[PDB]
Paper text:
Here, we characterize the O-methyltransferases BelI and CysG, which catalyze the initial step of β-lactone formation. Employing techniques such as crystallography, computational analysis, mutagenesis, and activity assays, we identified a His-His-Asp (HHD) motif in the active sites of the two enzymes, which is crucial for binding a catalytically active calcium ion. As expected, BelI as well as CysGΔN16 adopt the class I methyltransferase Rossmann fold, characterized by a core domain of a seven-stranded β-sheet flanked by α-helices. The HHD-motif enables regiospecific C1-carboxy group methylation of their respective malic substrates.
Due to the high crystallization tendency of CysGΔN16, subsequent mutagenesis experiments were focused on this variant. This approach enabled the production of both full-length and N-terminal truncated mutants in high purity, which were characterized in activity assays and used for structural studies. Therefore, we conducted structure-based mutagenesis by introducing non-conservative alanine residues in the HHD motif to further explore the metal-binding site.
Numbering used by the authors: 17 to 110, 112, 112A, 113 to 229
């Protein structure tokens, strides 16, 4: 229902979230310790749990209301913990095999994104992976209009309730997105040895940084 609405609002939901799960599964052991940053209702954590039954998940968000949905989703899961913290607050010490995030970090000022990527690398073990499923800006105003048309085309094709799309539009006014290549370069600046865009559908992209490989 909520998960159905996220699929209606997010072009290539299965490709982009699935790419995040696949790249983690190919980068970390079965028993990986994983931080889901801005976990919300725990959708990305849930996708990872489906693939990695033995992974320890820490779901972190500033919103207790969002994390209540995550607590309900993971009620019977003894390998899931929840932390209430802002991206800008001290991160959990870990170390972590993976730090993942979906549709959260684009809320931060650009300087705070650059600092967050560096702070994430500090809590990753050597060879650890950072993955972001992200809302990204087009590199030009003209291309941004085309990105917007492609997003609207998906929303309309998915028979999204008009009020939910209106609410989606209102939330996006507060967003501080940047182009995918700029923020992938920020991973290199943060000291990740490899950074790559795995999958992309115009405004939405899955990218990753590796802490040594
Ligand atoms: N500065 C910040 N610190 C922590 N969480 C933040 C944040 N800004 C936004 N968030 C959280 O980021 C989430 C964005 S919605 C995405 C939720 C989830 N990752 C999913 O894929 O469905 C919300 O849960 C919101 O509370
Ligand atoms: Ca948003
Ligand atoms: Na709760």
């Amino acid at each position: 229902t909520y998960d159905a609405l996220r699929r209606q609002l997010i072009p290539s939901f299965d490709l982009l979230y699935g790419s995040a799960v696949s790249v983690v599964a190919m980068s970390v052991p079965a028993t990986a310790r994983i931080l889901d940053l801005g976990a919300g209702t725990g959708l990305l954590g849930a996708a990872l749990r489906e693939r990695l039954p033995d992974a320890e998940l820490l779901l972190q968000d500033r919103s207790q209301a969002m994390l209540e949905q995550a607590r309900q989703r993971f009620a019977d899961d003894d390998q899931v913990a929840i932390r209430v913290a802002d991206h800008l607050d001290e991160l959990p010490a870990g170390p972590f095999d993976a730090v993942v995030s979906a549709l959260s970090i684009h809320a931060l000022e650009h300087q705070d994104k650059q600092d967050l990527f560096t702070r994430i690398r500090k809590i990753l073990r050597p060879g650890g992976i950072f993955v972001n499923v992200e809302q990204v800006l087009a590199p030009t105003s003209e291309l941004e209009k085309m990105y917007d048309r492609q997003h609207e085309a998906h929303v309309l094709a998915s028979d999204t309730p008009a009020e939910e799309w209106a609410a989606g539009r209102e939330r996006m006014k507060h967003d501080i997105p940047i182009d995918v290549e700029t923020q992938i370069q920020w991973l290199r600046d943060a000291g990740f040895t490899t950074a790559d865009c795995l999958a992309k559908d115009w405004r939405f992209a899955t990218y990753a940084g590796w802490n040594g490989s």
